[PDB]
Amino acid sequence: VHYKLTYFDGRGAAEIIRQIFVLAGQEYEDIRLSHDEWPKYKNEMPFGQLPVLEVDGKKLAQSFAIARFVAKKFGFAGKCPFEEALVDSITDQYKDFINEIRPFLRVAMGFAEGDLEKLSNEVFLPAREKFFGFMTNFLKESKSGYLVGDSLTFADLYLAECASEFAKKTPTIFDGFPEIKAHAEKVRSNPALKKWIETRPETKF
């Protein structure tokens, strides 16, 4: 079975898919297209966008559909049909949270001008508060330290990566959410992830 994953040069929407391959021990081509060459390849993608996974020559788009596909192959999608659905509900909520902080992310990423501190105070931190409060109710219920069931799933991976990364410039992101901080530390102490985080290309996004 050969895997190719195509994205731009950044962590962005592809990074959890890479971490699932990392945890599985599975080799894949990590293809990172430059801005200049993108218009030449856009046409090969099912919805003209990235990331795209190619699985023995067959193309699959949509980062959550790809993460789910790879997680199910390697045992990170949840351990029974109901737990898989809980994992899916959590990643769908995370997608809503990402959509909600769009105005913040567009300025923080240089794609628009605006008042970064104000967007942080008014858009990002209030949105993280609601999202972290729902994630914390899951962690209070699991009592394994993982969001769903007794072991790591790709829902754990989206939450820890986003919490750890936002923590770099938003120092107060864990204030009032000590379970969220413990989960991110627990997930990132996974030895395979920890080494990938040290070794991966160092990019702004």
> What six digits make up the tokens of 59?
């193309």
Binding site for a copy of itself (CB under 8 A): 46-48, 55, 58, 60-62, 64-66, 68-69, 72-73, 81-82, 84-86, 88-89, 92-93, 96, 99, 130, 134, 137
In terms of Cβ atoms closer than 10 Å to its own Cβ (0-12, 13-18, 19+), residue 169 is exposed
13 binds, among a copy of itself, ligand GSH, none (CB under 5 to 8 A by kind): ligand GSH
The CB-of-150 to a copy of itself minimum distance in angstroms stands at 17
* Site membership for ligand GSH, residue 44 (CB under 6 A): no
The full length of the chain comes to: 205
Pick the stretch among 58-66, 111-119, 152-160, 174-182 that binds ligand GSH (CB under 6 A): 58-66
- Is 26 known to sit in a ligand binding site? no
Q: Give residue 82's identity as a one-letter amino acid code.
A: F
> What six digits make up the tokens of 147?
């969001």
DSSP strand pairing (3-8 vs 29-33): parallel
Asked whether 160 and 180 are in contact (CB, 8 A), the reply is no
Binding residue for ligand GSH, selected from 29, 44, 92, 175, defined by CB under 6 A: 92
